[PDB]
């Protein structure tokens, strides 16, 4: 009593539909976050941060000059061939 003034078709259609949505997002958003469905720019998951924290761009090791590692103790060649030194046509700095 005294709420009937509010109760109305438009006030009801936006109350059932809108409320149904309020629960659809409140219950689905955590699942999307867990399954990496949310956009990365909007938010990064903890799993995303854990993997990204392991990435760096300063490793300059492991350069080899052969297609195969044929075992042994010597390993693949690691020294640039003499005939290849100074064979690059690099534009002047």
């Amino acid at each position: 009593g005294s709420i009937e003034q509010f109760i109305n078709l438009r006030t009801a259609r936006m109350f059932i539909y809108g409320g149904v949505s309020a629960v659809f997002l409140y219950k689905a958003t955590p699942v999307m976050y867990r399954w990496e469905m949310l956009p990365t720019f909007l938010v990064k998951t903890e799993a995303y941060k854990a993997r990204e924290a392991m990435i760096a761009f300063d490793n300059m090791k492991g350069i080899v000059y052969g297609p195969y590692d044929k075992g042994g103790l010597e390993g693949p060649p690691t020294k640039i061939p003499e005939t290849s030194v100074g064979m690059m046509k690099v534009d002047p700095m």
Binding site: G86, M87, M88, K89, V90
Partner: protein
């Protein structure tokens, strides 16, 4: 003139008031010297002269350039090699 199927929607022939002299082929008739083609104006046959001339020029340029490249440039594995395949300037071999 084209297909017998294409035609003007209104069948009109122009009463040309221009006084231009009639092209000779427009008033021509079949003759013993010209069993066929008497209604078409005679034209020059450029293909007979231009096709053998152009072909010779292209062959001469093609062969002359090939000989030149393979005799006026340092020895190399391919034509691109003989042009852009030397070591960097200042690299003494």
């Amino acid at each position: 003139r084209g297909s017998v199927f294409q035609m003007p929607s209104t069948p009109v022939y122009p009463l040309t008031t221009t006084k231009k002299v009639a092209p000779p082929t427009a008033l021509a008739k079949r003759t013993p010297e010209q069993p066929f083609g008497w209604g078409s104006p005679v034209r020059e046959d450029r293909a007979w002269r231009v096709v053998p001339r152009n072909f010779i020029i292209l062959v001469i340029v093609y062969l002359s350039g090939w000989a030149a490249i393979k005799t006026m440039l340092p020895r190399g594995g391919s034509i691109l090699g003989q042009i852009y395949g030397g070591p960097p300037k200042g690299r003494l071999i």
